[PDB]
Design a protein around this ligand. Structure first.
Ligand SMILES: [Zn+2]
Length: 216
């Protein structure tokens, strides 16, 4: 259990671009967009960092300091603080979500303004696009592709239903809880769908990262 270990450091500070911003801060998007644009290709970059929930999740100072919000850098595999982090480093669970419900209805699980409030039904469904590209056009059949989407998303929260739609090169992932959809959107954006066992793994950065958006 994540409760029985310290959160792992995911990256060294020196691997990240300077002027590291606060996750809820004024400049986060300027900084992150600049980061993204530094990568080659015209299509969405494939992030060199990734959350590995089992390996990475653990206690942080946030767990002991009354923190209710989750670490955005953690979700993206790029928190350099590990157990020093004042935000949470685990996958949101029912208990966390209950506490968040009492605390706010305008902020997401990361402490940012909710998407719905700047453009009653809580949206818990994500559109996942660019699947073929995130596999470097590997020849997989639908059963295999579905298994991969299910695997990576199910480790980010309780899944209500998942659908892979071959004709549209996309998937739809509906979570039981909005908090997990919020978390998973940040975790999976720009990710590869390749696995270490794939012949293509070493060349994963030549793909195009997953497109993950709120579904209609
Ligand atoms: Zn963190």
């Amino acid at each position: 259990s994540w409760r029985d270990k310290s959160a792992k450091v995911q990256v060294k500070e020196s691997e990240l671009p300077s002027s590291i911003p606060a996750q809820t801060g004024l400049t986060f998007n300027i900084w992150y967009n600049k980061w993204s644009q530094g990568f080659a290709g015209n299509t969405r970059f494939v992030s060199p960092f990734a959350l590995q929930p089992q390996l990475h999740s653990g206690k942080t100072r946030g767990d002991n300091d009354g923190q209710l919000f989750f670490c955005l850098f953690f979700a993206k595999g790029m928190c350099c603080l590990g157990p020093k982090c004042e935000y949470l480093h685990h996958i949101p669970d029912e208990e966390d979500i209950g506490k968040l419900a009492l605390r706010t209805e305008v902020l997401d699980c990361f402490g940012r303004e909710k998407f719905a409030d700047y453009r009653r039904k809580k949206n818990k469904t994500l559109y996942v696009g660019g699947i073929d590209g995130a596999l470097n056009s590997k020849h997989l059949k639908p059963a295999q592709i579905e298994s991969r989407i299910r695997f990576v998303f199910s480790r980010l929260g309780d899944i209500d239903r998942i659908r892979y739609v071959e004709s549209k090169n996309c998937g739809f992932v509906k979570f039981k809880y909005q908090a997990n959809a919020e978390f998973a959107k940040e975790a999976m954006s720009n990710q590869t769908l390749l696995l270490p066992s794939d012949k293509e793994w070493d060349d994963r950065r030549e793909g195009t990262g997953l497109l993950v958006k709120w579904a209609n």
